[model samples]
Target: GIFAFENEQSSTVAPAKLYKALTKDSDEIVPKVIEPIQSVEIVEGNGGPGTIKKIIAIHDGHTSFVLHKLDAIDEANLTYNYSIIGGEGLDESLEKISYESKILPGPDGGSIGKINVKFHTKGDVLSETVRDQAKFKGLGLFKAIEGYVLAHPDY
Candidate 1:
């Protein structure tokens, strides 16, 4: 079974800057600010399509991992998509989680973020509560980048 959902948020930072912070400098930013994400590493390939990246997280004394494969990165259009093909985050049910993220210019020199999350399941689907928790983490990560970019300004 496949299930998908989306979330959007507005940021004070511009689209280009927000996109850059979310992609180019993610390795430097994610682990630094997010308490749950302990580390991020590249497992294979370069920083383009098919690149496999690892994210290690700790929550409530439980350690888990998520691996993502870059599907595309369109800097010119401020869009990036990836698929979480494997990891402990899938638990025992999911096959993968694919993501399509876009940053668009918003009113007043700011930007709006559109996050699309699709879950491919091999067994049971995630509960609503669990899914929302994941949703918040993704958006929280985005928020963290927004704040970071706003504070630095030079990025």
Candidate 2:
């Protein structure tokens, strides 16, 4: 096993829209923002209570397990928590993974969404495989939500 972790925060356009995109139609993201993501297949239940999604990501003719959406939610504070399951590029012993997002009114009176990533894993793959994968995973997740809101044009 190895150790590789990261925590990042990014601002989004609309809080409510971001919330809906991530919690409601999470699977659609594989096709929208992340092109390397070839397909997302729902392996277990639906994206609700106990759903498990299997994501296939393609890069330069190579595909790998790029994502997993294990949980979804709609919180009272316009905050949502999504948990990742696992696949290729992810540590087999991934301990925990979570992302919390919320929107608030900025100084200009516009909504600014904030997202926090909490990733935990124990493995021996680092620097090349795990680090690169982590970077792409985080960026892909954020852009997916942002792209949805931008395209929907309701923020």
Candidate 3:
């Protein structure tokens, strides 16, 4: 059995700018600017739909190695999709968490972000926290990226 959810967020950054960082250049840029995530390196394949990216993060005295497989990336449409294959967070019964996300044009040149979440689990008791954890850090990265984009302007 499994459960799914959807979420939307707004960003001060524009669509193309946000999309570029989130999709094509995430592995190259995220670790450089964001905290907690020590680094993100490609484990296999190029930076495309089938690549396996490993994101290592150190938080609260724990080191988490998250492996995600890229499923799709459409630049013109601003859509990026991926799925988590393995991690320490949900080993009990969780198999994967598929994430389908996109960035849309928002008001005043800002952007709108929407994410569809699908958690693959088998009768495991999940909490509100686990479901919401991504959003918590997601926006932080967005804000940080926004800050850098604002400062750099030409980035």
Residue range 6-125, candidate 1, lDDT tens digits:
889988887888899999898889887887889989989988689998899997999888887999999999999988788887645677778999999999989999999987777666
Per-residue C-alpha lDDT of model 3 across residues 1-155, encoded as one tens digit per residue: 57777778787887898888777667766776877788888899986678997899887989987888999988889998988888774444567788888899999999988888787766666556766675565556666766676676676
Off by over 4 Å in 2: 1-12, 107-109, 123-132, 151-155
| TM-score per candidate | 0.88, 0.68, 0.82
- lDDT by residue for model 2 over 16-135, one digit each (tens)? 555566656666754677777777787778557666666777767877774455554555677666566566656555654566666665554346666666656565433456456666
Candidate 3: where are CA atoms >4 Å away?
60-62, 89-91
| lDDT for residue 86 in candidate 3, whole number 0-100 | 86
Which of candidates 2 and 3 is the stronger one according to lDDT?
Answer: 3
Clashing pairs in 2: 1-123, 1-124, 2-123, 2-124
